[PDB]
Amino acid sequence: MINIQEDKLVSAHDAEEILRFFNCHDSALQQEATTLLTQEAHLLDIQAYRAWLEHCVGSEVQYQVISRELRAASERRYKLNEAMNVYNENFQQLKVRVEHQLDPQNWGNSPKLRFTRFITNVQAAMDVNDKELLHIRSNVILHRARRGNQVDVFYAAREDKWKRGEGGVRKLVQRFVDYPERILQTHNLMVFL
Amino acid sequence: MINIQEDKLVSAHDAEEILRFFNCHDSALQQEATTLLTQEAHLLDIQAYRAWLEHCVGSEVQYQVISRELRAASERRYKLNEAMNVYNENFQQLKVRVEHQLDPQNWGNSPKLRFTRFITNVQAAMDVNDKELLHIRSNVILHRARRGNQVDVFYAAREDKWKRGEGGVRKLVQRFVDYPERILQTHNLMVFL
Amino acid sequence: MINIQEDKLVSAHDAEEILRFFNCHDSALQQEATTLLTQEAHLLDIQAYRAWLEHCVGSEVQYQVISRELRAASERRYKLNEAMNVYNENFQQLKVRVEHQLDPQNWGNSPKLRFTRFITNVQAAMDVNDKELLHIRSNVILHRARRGNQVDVFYAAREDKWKRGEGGVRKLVQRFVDYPERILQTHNLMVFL
Amino acid sequence: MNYNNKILVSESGLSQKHLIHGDEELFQHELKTIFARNWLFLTHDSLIPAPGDYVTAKMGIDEVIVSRQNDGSIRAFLNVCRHRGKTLVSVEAGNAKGFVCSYHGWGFGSNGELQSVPFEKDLYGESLNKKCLGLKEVARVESFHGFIYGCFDQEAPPLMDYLGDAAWYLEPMFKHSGGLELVGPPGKVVIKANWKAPAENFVGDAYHVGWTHASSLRSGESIFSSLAGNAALPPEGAGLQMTSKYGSGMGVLWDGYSGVHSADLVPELMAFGGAKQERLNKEIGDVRARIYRSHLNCTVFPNNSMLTCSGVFKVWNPIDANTTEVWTYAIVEKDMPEDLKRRLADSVQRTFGPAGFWESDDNDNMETASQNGKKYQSRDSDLLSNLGFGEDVYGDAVYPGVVGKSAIGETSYRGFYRAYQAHVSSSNWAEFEHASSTWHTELTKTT
Amino acid sequence: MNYNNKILVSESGLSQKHLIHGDEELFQHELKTIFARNWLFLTHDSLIPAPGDYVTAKMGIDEVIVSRQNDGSIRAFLNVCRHRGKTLVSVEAGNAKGFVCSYHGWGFGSNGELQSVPFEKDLYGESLNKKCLGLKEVARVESFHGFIYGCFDQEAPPLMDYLGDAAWYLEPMFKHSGGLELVGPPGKVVIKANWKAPAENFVGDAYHVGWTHASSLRSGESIFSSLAGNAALPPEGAGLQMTSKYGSGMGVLWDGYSGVHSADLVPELMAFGGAKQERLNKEIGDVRARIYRSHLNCTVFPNNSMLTCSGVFKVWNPIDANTTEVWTYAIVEKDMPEDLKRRLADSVQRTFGPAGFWESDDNDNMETASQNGKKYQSRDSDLLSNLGFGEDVYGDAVYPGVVGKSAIGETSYRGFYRAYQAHVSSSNWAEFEHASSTWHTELTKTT
Amino acid sequence: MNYNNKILVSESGLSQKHLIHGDEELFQHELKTIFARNWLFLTHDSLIPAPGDYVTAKMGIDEVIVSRQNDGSIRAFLNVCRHRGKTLVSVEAGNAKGFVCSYHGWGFGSNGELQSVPFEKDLYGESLNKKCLGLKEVARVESFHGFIYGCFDQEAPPLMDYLGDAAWYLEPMFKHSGGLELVGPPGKVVIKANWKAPAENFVGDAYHVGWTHASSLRSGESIFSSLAGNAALPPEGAGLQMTSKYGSGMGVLWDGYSGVHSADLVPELMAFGGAKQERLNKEIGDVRARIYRSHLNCTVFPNNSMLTCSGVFKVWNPIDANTTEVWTYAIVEKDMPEDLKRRLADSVQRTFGPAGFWESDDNDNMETASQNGKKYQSRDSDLLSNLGFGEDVYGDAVYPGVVGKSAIGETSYRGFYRAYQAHVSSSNWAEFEHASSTWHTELTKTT
Ligand SMILES: c1ccc2[nH]ccc2c1
Ligand SMILES: c1ccc2[nH]ccc2c1
Ligand SMILES: c1ccc2[nH]ccc2c1
Ligand code: FES
Ligand code: FES
Ligand code: FES
């Protein structure tokens, strides 16, 4: 649908993701993806991190949040690493982060933190080659509050792949976020987007 | 689904609410709850408070917003009142607040305020014992602007019970919010969440 | 449903818009409107402005965002222009704004900006007289980030008319926004709401 | 600005420069001369009853830990580790025998003592003098019938003497009722106002009630209603105003025991207060038993305010010249049935808490008056507090203090600002006493 | 910093220290020496035409109420209650015979007088001297062809004298066209720039147009286009620059009557302006009738700017050294057909309002130049304004003021900053006059 | 405050006033005496290897462009246009032969020279002296094994001399390993802490590791683990601490080459480091080859810190007294297999980047200790750094500098704060040298 020679601001990656959703629209799949993401965001909001790992996250997951360096729109010569990885986790690494959240000596989790997540703009399309796999796109606003007057609000678009799994338990196999703010003003990015 | 001995950060209350939604999923009920909440949030946004009371609020309502004191995650001895009530209203008390909003001498409502509400993450499940009653969970972002440059944004999860009523007019019988920010930085909490 | 003599804070315009949606509810239309707006907001977020114009915007469009002067709630004598137009664009004027975004010498678009849009509270109703036309109401949170640490977040309700067009390509023929913040604290309103 | 000489408050408290609500250098100077010198509310016995119970509280911009000791006394300490200065306690209330720092693990007792240091033998050997490393202690902590106040200045008058003539008016409800309890947790909200804006309003402003609260009175369904929109001026003899040497003062609205509570609580409260007043007539006399069930709007200098009978209890915690963090508790009589306590507590929060519809009426008044103190053409303008001037008395045979025998006036503003002036231009308590040796004569001129 | 001696602006306005766009002590000092001393835009007759009509406006950081009196004159008062300092009016425009305070209900007339105090007889008796309690009035309020300006300093030159040599250039459009109207409400947006950054850009910066606005000119479809990306330098004799004793100045781009308006308005505007110029040739001469339909980019010292013909009218309201609230109105000729007025007003907002695509091109330039004035290594650096220096004249036979007979230069920056220097180092109008007795000689050195 | 006389740091660096982490006047004074005088990290050769490559970097609050010249050298310039002060470069890295300003189009080369001005002949003629209008250049730019530092003060010691005794400890890993590379882009996050809070923690704080990082060590699956919750004190002889004349210092934890990396990287790293150490024994001796594969926690004065072996590299960029922008890069050995480089880089960000679970453990410690420096009762309190005092030596036969032969202590805090004191009370480098002529004697008292 997009011609990126004409639509000069659009990246090749973004144009490919638009092509995936404007073709085969299955309303039932969209509703199913909406339920899945609302349940995942409820487990995270109540800080049921073990339940999230067990019910929502696949053993082959890649959970990745990048931060891209700011470069000129006309850049074409400088070709060094374009982005670092804020997260680039396999299942074991997510498990380490969950154990860190749950440890009694994680002093920053006392008083208990308060999370509220707002998931919108859900789109879903099956993968063309692997029918175990569903592409789901959604945007999240995440509010994390603590210690009386600390309030941090995170904003991001999520490009996910979820696989059927067994027993109706669809599980995340890839989450990719290109975080929109280069310099974070939320103290850290220590939240699961 | 949750074991709160293992998922150490999860409260018993929150684990019960998750159990309510992951079992019997009725897609039609979710859509109906989404319409109901979008209509309620439109009436509130245009400040049709009498219409909200008449169309959306049951005579037996409890409308409650609490603020929980910050206590240690390992606390087990101090057992005094855990939270005050920012709101804990019956129908008559809501009516007093609506009359206060509508009074010509409410000087703070001139120039007219501007409200925008964003309702997401809707989940719905029928009560097991009372079939007049539907449990609806949803999250709200509320933006209240006034006086040129005052902007306040509120964030919260809502645990509601709505009853069938008559003529297709479903009405709120309980709204419970555990407000996530302990110290408010919005001047007041004088908005209907 | 609303009586604006009793519901003293409600404008005649707002009461008419509520009447449009509480009567004939078509769940299928609501889902279709949700898909349409999610696709439009994806094209805008990836800055595919030409694709947005070609796929989403009708040749007869009026794209209008007003800013209303703050006046007393009891005002009845002063009758000068109530609001200026932040936007009041026809198709050609939107095309000029898109060419301005895409020009290589638009220095403020280097480093590339990052947009994230959150569309909620979707309602849809067919026009009574023109069956080519669908009324769609929705609220948007728009996040625009750039230059490391500039973050601006816009909030608004949108009153749209979309027409069937041809080939399943529904296109915007009117967008009306009454922007809720009188003094903007986002540097400019240079975003498509 | 030279605070020895600058006339911020005019003679007899008649007017104040508008800059006092906006000037940030003055705010820093108030941290020393107001907040580090005077008595500040901390907590109530009912919130820390048992050994080990603690709460955190602000004293000016400082945060302190307030802890019930094993011997039954209360001690309060800065909430700052003696090693590298991390904040020790991150919660608002609890029960503990000590506090451990999350940075390097030093452990302090509930008595402030440095009790343990990780690997002290291997690391410090015998070099660490733990006896000199206890938490910085609030010098003075005293109680007024269960209400606990702190003062960083060892030289301050005892709390009972500091309350001066206001104590006589508080005693019927604080002491002769059988005692009050403070219902927690407080509501907590930030307002963009100077701390003095709400303090002056609660100490002496009955004039604003009919107009500012016209919608709350009319919607509300309370006993002071008929005042909505200034439709009626209260009866001759409907109340009085008073002020005192150290700045505390209040208004007295005779018999308004249900206060701001809507009609749903009116009957039960009017019935409880009048029954206790009948018993109290024999013990403390008819005037004092009437004061018990009369509505007092009071500020205990500097920044603690209350509405007795309505049961509202406030702390106006200063953050900067145009920022205040408002803490709102409910006060109830200990011998009121439990169910009535619970309903009164919700009612306090309904009307004056975070979503309090009466308190919301005051927001724009408090915020804009404070913010206009920063505006160039208003800094040197004069805020007026002359209502009732020249009709105030002192040493009356029935009512003590500097008293204005009228329900509406500005007597209490003048006493508050006379004391504020005398503190901001003084370097210590002795200088304040010298500046206040003719305090009541200054306030009663023209009378 | 000692403002009598510090050289913030070098001789002949050739350079300015970069700290002037970031230093907060200087901003506070400008509140006194710039904003409380000079003439500031308030409103237009067209926005308050009838008795009782009012608007609120800023004057520096102060807010004033500007009201049409029953006798047809305009008076302006601080928007601050004389009792306890609450903000009186919370709306932007209306029609009223008076303003009542929401705190205690005092009522002030449209003429500023304290007209009523709730329960004045019962409370103040005859003590309140209401005659001395009127709102604080702006000393000077004058009109330039319907454009209303205010000044807090009674000593300022009359507004017509203060406009100096710039008045001659404004008169063709402001007076000889038949009169202008101001179309409201303004757009209102905050930018993170010092007020001087946009003021200097509008007073004298034609150099930035081709590069800063390359995308707007190219996309835009306007008459100054060919300049996009500096692809062409305007013709020899395409315009001129001027400045004046009290700081106002402008650039003149001959015949650019359609200004920044896209191609959709070009033909109709070029046709309206050229028809009125033909009529004006007989009345005011060919040069002045040409000036009428020539684009003027002007700043009326300190912080009011405009683009005639394009019809953009701005107020750069100062908030702090790196914050400005930008107000944008449209100006139209009163005898233009209504439909053309409406389209021109939208066009002004389309290009220079809150979502103005031309104004957005300037954001980063104005914000970063201002914020870099705070950075340690840049505070004492020199901003350059030497383009055209040594080619400026004064007292020309055809064009008045200090004039640079070239379309692109920095003549007007030098005049603006010479006047700014003379104000910041002066304690009053007399000292400014003494510091400006050789103003044009200083600006024309090397010529 | 008089910085010549005020004792902010007590003799021998034993304690510091808590106000140093909160006072904004001191922060402004540090811009001059700390940031404009000392060597600050800019970039690495690996991030700008080819002619034309550039990056932007902060130096204190100033932003500079750092560019690889055609001759292979590196020059750095303020990122501020010489005309009207706009920010020249808005990206973080790139490749260019010059930088053009978006305001008026002036073009500067990569060498800082003003190379082109739009329409220079028509506008300035020959008047513009472009030779005097190059970008403001950073006087001193030097490399330590590919790590590039800048200094605005021409008088500073050479960078190698400024590193003093710390250079000997860095050389095994920075030089004898074959060289390090810096992996970009950095993570970038704002924290509400003073810059000195993280700098002091990285220069000398091993005491906090077991307690602050108890959850990260226990969850983590790293080699320093057993310390979780202070369950074990490291072996006698497990490390040492050192400090130097110009303030840089570090801790040395023997053989901890896998550092904070979880168990997934432990084996491969312990295997790579021990193989290179065997080769290095023959070249630099057993002690220095052991130092290569030993974990160093170091701060290069003022605000650059690192963890060798773990590969964490930080810049604590000051914004105000309680705001710091944290930049986090990874450092890897150039001869490590590519795949291991990539995994180590992710591991650095996993543990200490924007979502670093170890770095998040320190947030509350750094923020609250800094913010408590503003609180009235804490400003004049003393932060303690006496652990190990009286056991430090200087001039040892095997380990250079002022050395504490124990793994946990406060030796490095004392050296950092002695140097900080000597800078804040000095007007230039000569005065710092005079104030530091008995630097090691002051630090070794009691020993
Ligand atoms: C009643 C009477 C006087 C008062 N001052 C502040 C609140 C209030 C209520
Ligand atoms: C045209 C000419 C000069 C100008 N200065 C600022 C805007 C503008 C437009
Ligand atoms: C290991 C040892 C000492 C340290 N100081 C700061 C981080 C860190 C890690
Ligand atoms: S700062 Fe508390 S133990 Fe070190
Ligand atoms: S502050 Fe206006 S009437 Fe009192
Ligand atoms: S500010 Fe850079 S060219 Fe003018």
Ligand SMILES: [Fe+3]
């Ligand atoms: Fe009030």
Ligand SMILES: [Fe+3]
């Ligand atoms: Fe411009």
Ligand SMILES: [Fe+3]
């Ligand atoms: Fe640490």
